[PDB]
């Protein structure tokens, strides 16, 4: 579901003060500059993203600070923050496991990936580890269906997965070290048939300039 009500706790409470770090500030100036001067409320989404970067999650203090900064009524900021799912309104931890479970993913074993993650971490998809160190999430299409078994950690994609390989990825993450930045145990460079390239077998690309319309 989507939780659409905020209940004040001692953490994540309006009285808690949230201010942008000076670097985050300068970045906020730079991002507000892009939109017209009168329409600077259009920058709420990037500003909320900056807040969720500085602090772990999108708290009510972050929402109100952004609302004050763009002189918007906090209710508009609340509508924005609750409308978009990439805004995380509860605190999580260091790594945020996001399994894609749309049909192309399942047709290639995202149930196996899901089981592997759930066996390694007893937690349910919504829950987080008692160490807070991992947080799982079932997610819709992440836009890399060419690699049907795939997953994301915080911002990086990890694709063409295997259950026996998803466990190994997990423990490498648990130790603290990141095994690979590349999406997979290297089997392809990210879009070509596993049998290797079938087209574009030329050492140098043809210039477009050889073909001219004569229109100039």
């Amino acid at each position: 579901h989507i939780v659409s009500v905020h209940r004040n706790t001692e953490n994540n409470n309006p009285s808690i003060p949230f201010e942008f770090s000076p670097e985050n500030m300068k970045r906020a100036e730079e991002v507000i500059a892009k939109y017209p001067p009168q329409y600077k409320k259009a920058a709420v989404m990037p500003l909320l993203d900056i807040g969720q970067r500085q602090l772990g999650y999108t708290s009510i203090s972050v929402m109100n600070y952004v609302a004050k900064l763009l002189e918007m009524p906090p209710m508009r900021v609340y509508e924005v923050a609750t409308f978009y799912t990439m805004y995380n309104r509860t605190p999580m931890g260091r790594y945020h496991l996001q399994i894609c479970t749309t049909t192309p993913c399942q047709l290639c074993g995202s149930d196996g990936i899901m089981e592997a993650v759930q066996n390694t971490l007893n937690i349910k998809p919504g829950e987080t580890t008692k160490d807070n160190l991992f947080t799982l999430s079932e997610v819709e299409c992440l836009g890399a269906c060419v690699n049907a078994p795939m997953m994301a950690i915080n911002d990086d994609y990890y694709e063409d997965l295997t259950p026996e390989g998803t466990v190994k990825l997990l423990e490498d993450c648990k130790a603290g070290k990141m095994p690979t930045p590349g999406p997979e145990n290297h089997v392809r460079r990210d879009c070509e048939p596993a049998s290797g390239q079938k087209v574009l077998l030329s050492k140098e690309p043809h210039n477009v300039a050889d073909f001219l319309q004569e229109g100039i």
Partner: protein, 209 residues
Amino acid sequence: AEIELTIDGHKVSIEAGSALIQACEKAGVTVPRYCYHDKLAIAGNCRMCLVDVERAPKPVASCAYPVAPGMVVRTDTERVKQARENVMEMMLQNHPLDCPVCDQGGECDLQDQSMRYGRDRGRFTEITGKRSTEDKNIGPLVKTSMNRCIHCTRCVRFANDIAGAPELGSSGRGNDMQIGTYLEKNLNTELSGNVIDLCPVGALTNKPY
């Protein structure tokens, strides 16, 4: 200046740029609605007011379709009736069975237009049941039973535009979209009592009454 069009055979003349529903009202043709109101911005989210215009392939929202010269409008086509039934069927799917206990009862637009345009019976018998919604405290004047909200945004439109009280709004997305303040805040304005009249269903109600 004033332009000309035909609605259900009749001939009705209306100022250019007006909405089709204003033309229908002027011409004596009754169109059902929920989200449209004469004093509020046009919203077009209820989809109750659909009509057929010969130029468009699909039925058009009458509250938000601007009039044009020579337009031909039919409010009584079989497609229109089927459309109203479909819209009502969908509207009542998650509506609570609260009429004996709803204060609106006997003066509820959902009742009257379901009786006039909807089907005699229902098709929704799902073992998973209906959606339910938290109740929200917005002060000692306006009692809230948000299970009944049909999401017409009249309350939001009024509170924002007319009374200048922006604490009211819609949070969440899709099925879980809830009218409220997203946190405990009173609907604080001297005109608040009017959302009681604007809310077509019993979601917002006079509390001392």
